[PDB]
Design a protein around this ligand. Structure first.
Ligand SMILES: *[C@H](C)[C@H]1/C(=C/c2[nH]c(/C=C3N=C(/C=C4\NC(=O)C(CC)=C4C)C(C)=C\3CCC(=O)O)c(CCC(=O)O)c2C)NC(=O)[C@@H]1C
Ligand SMILES: *[C@H](C)[C@H]1/C(=C/c2[nH]c(/C=C3N=C(/C=C4\NC(=O)C(CC)=C4C)C(C)=C\3CCC(=O)O)c(CCC(=O)O)c2C)NC(=O)[C@@H]1C
Ligand SMILES: *[C@H](C)[C@H]1/C(=C/c2[nH]c(/C=C3N=C(/C=C4\NC(=O)C(CC)=C4C)C(C)=C\3CCC(=O)O)c(CCC(=O)O)c2C)NC(=O)[C@@H]1C
Ligand SMILES: CCC1=C(C)/C(=C/C2=NC(=C\c3[nH]c(/C=C4\NC(=O)[C@H](C)[C@H]4CC)c(C)c3CCC(=O)O)/C(CCC(=O)O)=C2C)NC1=O
Ligand SMILES: CCC1=C(C)/C(=C/C2=NC(=C\c3[nH]c(/C=C4\NC(=O)[C@H](C)[C@H]4CC)c(C)c3CCC(=O)O)/C(CCC(=O)O)=C2C)NC1=O
Ligand SMILES: CCC1=C(C)/C(=C/C2=NC(=C\c3[nH]c(/C=C4\NC(=O)[C@H](C)[C@H]4CC)c(C)c3CCC(=O)O)/C(CCC(=O)O)=C2C)NC1=O
Ligand SMILES: CCC1=C(C)/C(=C/C2=NC(=C\c3[nH]c(/C=C4\NC(=O)[C@H](C)[C@H]4CC)c(C)c3CCC(=O)O)/C(CCC(=O)O)=C2C)NC1=O
Ligand SMILES: CCC1=C(C)/C(=C/C2=NC(=C\c3[nH]c(/C=C4\NC(=O)[C@H](C)[C@H]4CC)c(C)c3CCC(=O)O)/C(CCC(=O)O)=C2C)NC1=O
Ligand SMILES: CCC1=C(C)/C(=C/C2=NC(=C\c3[nH]c(/C=C4\NC(=O)[C@H](C)[C@H]4CC)c(C)c3CCC(=O)O)/C(CCC(=O)O)=C2C)NC1=O
Ligand SMILES: CCC1=C(C)/C(=C/C2=NC(=C\c3[nH]c(/C=C4\NC(=O)[C@H](C)[C@H]4CC)c(C)c3CCC(=O)O)/C(CCC(=O)O)=C2C)NC1=O
Ligand SMILES: CCC1=C(C)/C(=C/C2=NC(=C\c3[nH]c(/C=C4\NC(=O)[C@H](C)[C@H]4CC)c(C)c3CCC(=O)O)/C(CCC(=O)O)=C2C)NC1=O
Ligand SMILES: CCC1=C(C)/C(=C/C2=NC(=C\c3[nH]c(/C=C4\NC(=O)[C@H](C)[C@H]4CC)c(C)c3CCC(=O)O)/C(CCC(=O)O)=C2C)NC1=O
Lengths: 213, 172, 162, 162, 173, 172, 162, 172
């Protein structure tokens, strides 16, 4: 509804042209229309798992059978396919329970758009939309952004645009945040403590009598 | 992205009062000097590529260690970085001249240039000399009258010399 | 904000190219338009106390119930009528802002963004300010081409209310 | 193609809004400018046979080897010189196109897109047409403000070659 | 594709590959003289944009009452809004074409798939044409009357606007 | 991604001189030991999954608190993190053995592992120990001759023990 | 950089799998190719001063105007001819680099990336270095399989210039 | 004898370069403000004799032993001696404002004046109490506006008082 918070963009490796003509350490950025085979589509369906979830969370239970079938059929465009993984409640429990709203901006830019966030003030800018539009509505506004649709195009798996000397993003950003880790240490269940006996100590009634002489 | 007009607008919005009379008197002067502003901006983009190569030669002579091996601008790939990106200063400078304000210059071409070089290893000082070699030629291109009507624009050309000096001192 | 100078700037920014003659001709169009628009702003700033008195009394005679009905939203009490001249006194600033800026930037950024969002909540009927602006449209007293420029921003605000 | 009328149109299309006063002022900047640009196009169309004869002979005297060196790329044979007047005869059309359109649209769509792409393949040095246009820049015979407007497009093509 | 009256002549003169002829520059010089009347007509529509959407909607939904009646295609408040919102989109692309002076922008955005999209949607094409034909007699009538303005006959220019709605109407129904 | 060859190339590019004769004499030796490089790398990937499970049991015995509740590798999802991941050390180690250089090992599997754990709560020391349990078994798999021709590769196996020690000490 | 060892590495990285026999066979194709390529590099490093003297004089006799025409871009002055032997002295390094690396990595990363980008700006005609490399292609003096290996990288640079 | 016009030549000769465009924009402001100075200068010289005695109505009234028997302004040619050269301060300060640079002031009033003023026996510090009293009357006349079009004269006035402060520093 309301137009977005105006954010200043910083200098970033993809924001400009760079005259690298295809370097080797650059990704293999895949396309659906090349395949014509059983064979090619299994590799292409694996690299999109490797982008949006991460290698560590690429286990079989999480994977969706219906979505994989669609790509082979070709009924759904790969850009329409990534919407399945971002609005998947198997994905949603792993990342939305554990990450705050401002980290949820940063993780979606870092994976889906394949770009670093510019500044801090633009994760604030995208934040209002997510709370009101939901997680699905913020993802929907990110994939239908003009920036995403022009540069990745219609059928090309997400990837990092320019990384001349830049950290891989899967390695760079943890699935969960530094905040949610501190809760895990707080509910560690320390052993032999005085704190777990505090709720038992108040239930016991003690009467004390003092004599003065 | 701000103008001279929206500079006054966003300043008058914060006080929450109507636009005063002398502010409209000052903006009426910007209308009168508006045609001289198109004289200066059109002269730079016509000489855009000629002033990139000419400032590059004067830079790479006077610091020869750059295109020498081991230098930051040695190989042909990086070199096309430190040559074609000299347009990007001029792209955002002539935006700011036609805007008449330094807001567009600040949040695109100034907000992270002194940031991005520590991770890159590009020397900050070398770039400053380069933009400062653009400034004395960009002022000199717009100064000389050949086939235009004579006017006075020294109060306007000093804005252009301020814009390069804003771009230079924010990095080095 | 939106200005046909900065409209030429932000368009040339996304393509990543210099200010060609395409963006340059958009500047002059803003420049010579200001000379029919700056004295269009001088006609409103000189008549500031007339119009906010005129439009506020025009609202009460159009809607006679808004002076009688008990509620915060209405103008039954004194602080309602104190908030009456504040609101239409706030409209005439942005019209003089958007006439001087030469675009619908300040009308976008300061008035109509979320204007249909708040009026559902505070049950302020937008047809109140429609008749308020239509009194200013007929009684601003401006003449010639400059008056016409001022009029469009009045009509651009009305279509944003509806 | 790019035209500061259609530049105002395509900008208002992506926002999904009506033609406000922001896009409207970009139109009359194009309109008035045409009256100093249409007789800037009439100065070139009347002098059509002069300039393509003048620029072609100016290239040969600047580069005397291009008439002697044996190769298809050069102008040693007759069909080279027949392709010489075709090329500079093709440049003067687009300059008259982009003067009449009032923007750098036809220069973008018809000349400079892929112009640095083909010259690497056919080993046509772009500095040949630099000196060709610079003869037209000095000998087009146009005068006044209109000539200056016409000239930018000559200088806009030169920066695209380099 | 987005074309002008100027780039209409340019792309036509590009195909023949010859210079621009003298009478074509004489004709385009006339478009410069009628250029200020073109801004008179385009500014008058967008000022009365929302007033002519609601006014043409009531005249449509009276004279075909079965639409907002239940079972109709524009019955529920959602579809209704879409239909209401859409009637601007004809006017958005018409006043683009008036200021362009050419029907190329009107054709490839608002005309290229409207008669396409309705067979899958169930919306009635004939009714829509009527809705646009109810805009046309009011949009011409808004730009016709002179109040506080110089009087000149552009009747040769207003007929372009009546042609643009008739191009938009007949391509659907 | 660098080789032993492109190590010499990028080093000789910085000095800007031709390749010297003894550098070509040294690289000719890498051609002669090139066939010993293929066998060692091939052997590891044949015993890849057997050495992941075998180093996992020796880790989770000797630190029992990990798969005990409250531990960092307690639940299966986390557990399939620490276990599968152990291939990713071996994926980037055997890249570096076949490359003969530690550049591919550094910017993928070493550049942020000591980074990512403070936000994760995983113990860096425990991970380091696990990789050090891979090293004495990966060297021992490539050491023993069974059905291969006997040769000497102690100057080459020490590169593999250096690669795990580079991977271990950069984290813990 | 690109090397058919690292080409096998970066391909197996994106699939996230171990070095199978698919990537392993790409290694020994690089290994036994080096023995016909390392003495192909020894033929160039021993003849270093011959070829940069030979190719520079071959350019002047092919293009006789490049010694006479006044300009920085040309070789009229002494510092032009000092920059002449620097440029072709820089080409022979990368050919010896890309022969030793066994791939077109150093030719990609150090020479041809942005090579068509700079030559439009400094008006250095690429056909100058075409005839420079073609003298090295005929004067190398290499024989056998090694000559064939040193012959492709010369031709791979020529197609990158054009 | 130097100027504003000639001193920006003389350092430009010592570096041996052509005059830059921002030095010519500096001198263009000097020509622009030139008309005011002639007007300012003429008011000092027309009230030149009225300043000196009105300074002598306080130079001697504040330190009254000077004209009392014993002081160095006592006898009549001694009294006419400190009116003979009270005006020579005004004779060369007005030359300094005309030239616009104090380089003609420092050869005549500032060069050897502090040497004679201990050779003669006159109080040197008792001069600079009254040259300040001249400056209090000089800038009062030069600023006062009567029958003159009004423009800001702040820049000219401050550095008129700087010439008196240089005239008081080298005597005291
Ligand atoms: C130039 C005068 C100096 C110089 C530059 C040089 N730069 C790079 C690499 C990059 N520069 C940028 C810069 C920007 N990105 C932006 O968005 C903006 C604002 C619009 C700027 C100014 C970026 C992103 C890079 C990385 C590659 C790329 O262009 O995408 C290099 C290459 C360094 C390397 O090691 O690869 C060089 C050499 N060099 C000089 O000597 C000058 C002093
Ligand atoms: C209200 C009592 C005070 C106030 C509110 C106010 N806030 C903003 C701007 C933002 N508010 C947020 C808040 C959240 N984002 C979240 O994700 C969540 C949890 C789901 C919350 C609570 C954010 C991110 C912003 C930045 C912009 C945005 O809307 O997306 C404004 C607008 C200010 C502006 O536009 O500059 C206002 C008015 N401010 C006050 O004045 C009250 C004191
Ligand atoms: C109103 C006069 C008639 C009418 C219209 C009606 N339209 C729809 C649904 C859609 N209409 C569009 C139209 C456009 N999309 C474009 O991009 C353009 C060009 C700019 C146009 C004109 C689209 C995309 C939809 C569907 C989704 C969406 O709008 O977001 C409906 C909805 C029907 C339904 O069952 O959903 C209706 C009813 N209805 C009439 O009876 C009139 C003749
Ligand atoms: C966007 C396209 C466009 C351009 C380019 C443009 C320029 C332009 N510059 C003008 C004037 C002028 N331009 C200059 C500029 C200068 N004189 C000097 O000696 C200085 C060195 C220099 C400034 C640095 C001057 C002095 C005038 C005199 C007339 C005036 O004040 O406008 C005018 C007045 C009207 C006319 O010339 O017909 C035009 C048209 N107008 C346009 O519509
Ligand atoms: C700077 C431009 C600007 C304007 C004009 C503006 C108006 C504005 N008027 C409001 C309320 C109001 N507006 C009015 C005004 C009126 N109601 C009546 O009964 C009369 C008919 C009419 C006056 C003639 C009143 C009485 C309220 C308080 C209503 C409420 O609290 O529910 C509100 C919501 C609450 C608020 O903050 O006070 C806004 C945002 N806001 C802006 O930012
Ligand atoms: C509409 C804008 C436009 C231009 C200008 C254009 C030029 C153009 N000139 C070409 C060739 C050529 N261009 C020239 C022209 C020259 N060579 C010389 O020796 C002289 C120095 C110089 C003329 C002054 C010649 C002789 C050829 C044929 C070369 C060949 O066949 O290899 C070619 C490649 C082959 C072709 O289709 O004929 C193009 C594309 N193409 C375009 O679409
Ligand atoms: C009812 C039928 C009718 C129309 C339509 C009409 C329009 C009309 N607009 C005119 C002028 C004009 N119209 C405009 C309008 C604009 N210029 C811009 O750049 C702005 C964007 C835009 C306003 C938003 C301008 C600037 C003029 C100049 C002449 C004048 O002031 O009237 C004139 C003056 C006389 C003439 O052109 O022959 C006419 C006739 N006259 C009529 O009798
Ligand atoms: C290519 C280089 C690379 C590496 C190595 C890497 C590791 C890495 N391991 C992670 C989590 C993890 N890492 C482990 C591993 C361990 N935890 C334990 O308990 C054991 C002590 C230890 C293994 C020995 C586990 C179990 C998780 C899941 C933890 C969680 O989900 O909170 C995460 C965050 C979530 C993820 O995407 O899976 C990253 C980024 N990322 C990289 O990009
Ligand atoms: C990429 C797929 C691939 C592999 C894996 C490969 C390995 C390989 N290792 C070989 C030899 C060899 N490999 C070794 C290796 C060793 N001997 C020891 O005792 C050491 C412990 C150890 C090194 C650490 C030795 C000693 C030879 C003897 C023959 C030779 O020098 O190549 C040979 C020679 C030809 C043959 O065996 O038929 C092959 C094929 N060739 C291939 O095409
Ligand atoms: C490491 C690989 C490498 C090479 C080879 C290279 C060449 C190269 N030569 C250049 C200029 C030049 N190149 C030459 C060379 C020649 N011009 C002539 O007239 C002769 C025909 C010819 C020599 C035979 C000259 C004279 C210049 C200076 C031209 C100028 O300043 O405009 C330039 C642009 C300016 C510069 O930094 O000096 C580059 C980038 N750059 C690289 O990174
Ligand atoms: C052209 C620049 C110039 C100046 C200004 C100048 C001053 C000057 N004043 C002198 C003496 C004097 N100067 C003064 C002035 C003063 N003593 C006082 O008691 C007062 C405080 C004060 C005046 C305000 C007097 C009274 C004498 C005579 C003292 C003596 O004869 O011993 C003398 C030494 C004797 C002489 O020739 O008269 C010199 C050289 N000479 C120069 O060439
Ligand atoms: C050599 C003979 C000569 C004199 C004396 C002279 C003075 C002189 N002073 C002028 C202006 C002026 N002069 C002043 C001076 C001042 N205003 C203040 O309020 C300040 C206190 C003071 C400076 C300290 C000002 C403000 C102007 C306004 C016009 C201008 O900028 O020149 C002008 C402008 C033209 C005119 O007045 O007709 C003249 C003639 N011109 C001559 O040819």
């Amino acid at each position: 509804s309301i137009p977005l918070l105006e954010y200043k963009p910083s200098s970033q490796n993809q924001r400009v042209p760079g005259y690298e003509v295809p370097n080797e350490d650059t990704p293999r950025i895949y396309r659906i229309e090349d395949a014509a085979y059983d064979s090619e589509l299994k590799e292409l369906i694996w690299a999109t798992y490797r982008q949006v979830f991460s290698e560590h969370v690429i286990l079989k239970f999480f994977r969706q059978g219906n979505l994989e079938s669609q790509l082979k059929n070709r009924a759904i465009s790969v850009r329409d396919f990534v919407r399945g993984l971002a609005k998947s409640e198997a994905f949603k429990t792993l990342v939305i329970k554990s990450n705050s709203n401002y980290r949820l901006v940063e993780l979606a830019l870092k994976r889906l758009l394949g770009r670093a966030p510019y500044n801090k003030d633009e994760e604030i800018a995208w934040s209002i939309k997510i709370a009101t539009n939901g997680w699905d509505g913020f993802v929907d506004a990110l994939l239908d952004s003009e920036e995403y649709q022009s540069n990745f195009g219609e059928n090309i798996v997400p990837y990092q645009r320019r990384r001349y000397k830049d950290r891989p993003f899967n390695l760079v950003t943890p699935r969960y945040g530094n905040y949610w880790r501190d809760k895990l240490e707080s509910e560690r269940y320390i052993e032999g403590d005085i704190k777990n006996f505090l709720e038992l100590a108040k239930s016991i009634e003690i009467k004390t009598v003092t004599f003065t002489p | 992205t701000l103008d001279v007009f929206t500079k006054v607008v966003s300043q008058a919005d914060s006080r929450g009062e109507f636009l005063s009379n002398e502010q409209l008197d000052a903006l009426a002067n910007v209308v009168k000097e508006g045609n001289k502003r198109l004289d200066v901006v059109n002269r730079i983009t016509s000489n855009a590529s000629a002033i990139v190569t000419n400032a590059a030669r004067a830079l790479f002579e006077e610091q020869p260690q750059l295109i020498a091996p081991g230098g930051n601008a040695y190989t042909n790939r990086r070199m096309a970085a430190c040559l074609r990106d000299m347009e990007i200063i001029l792209r955002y400078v002539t935006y700011a001249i036609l805007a008449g304000d330094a807001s567009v210059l600040d949040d695109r071409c100034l907000n992270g240039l002194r940031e991005t070089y520590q991770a890159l290893g590009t020397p900050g000082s070398s770039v400053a000399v380069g933009v400062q070699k653009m400034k004395d030629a960009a002022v000199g291109i717009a100064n000389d009258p050949n086939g235009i009507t004579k006017g006075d624009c020294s109060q306007l050309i000093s804005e252009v010399a301020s814009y390069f000096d804003r771009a230079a001192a924010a990095v080095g | 904000v939106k200005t046909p100078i900065t409209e030429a700037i932000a368009a040339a920014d996304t393509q990543g190219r210099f200010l060609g003659n395409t963006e340059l001709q958009s500047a002059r169009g803003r420049y010579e338009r200001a000379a029919a628009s700056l004295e269009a702003a001088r006609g409103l700033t000189s008549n500031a106390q007339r119009l906010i008195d005129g439009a506020t009394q025009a609202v009460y005679q159009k809607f006679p119930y808004t002076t009688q009905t008990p509620g915060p939203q209405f103008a039954a009490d004194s602080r309602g009528k104190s908030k009456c001249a504040r609101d239409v006194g706030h409209y005439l600033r942005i019209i003089t802002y958007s006439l001087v800026a030469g675009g619908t930037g300040p009308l976008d950024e300061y008035l109509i963004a979320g204007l249909a969002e708040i009026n559902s909540t505070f049950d302020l009927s937008p047809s109140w300010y429609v008749e308020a602006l239509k009194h200013i449209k007929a009684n601003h007293g401006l003449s010639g081409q400059a008056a016409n420029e001022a009029n469009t921003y009045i009509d651009y605000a009305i279509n944003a209310l509806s």
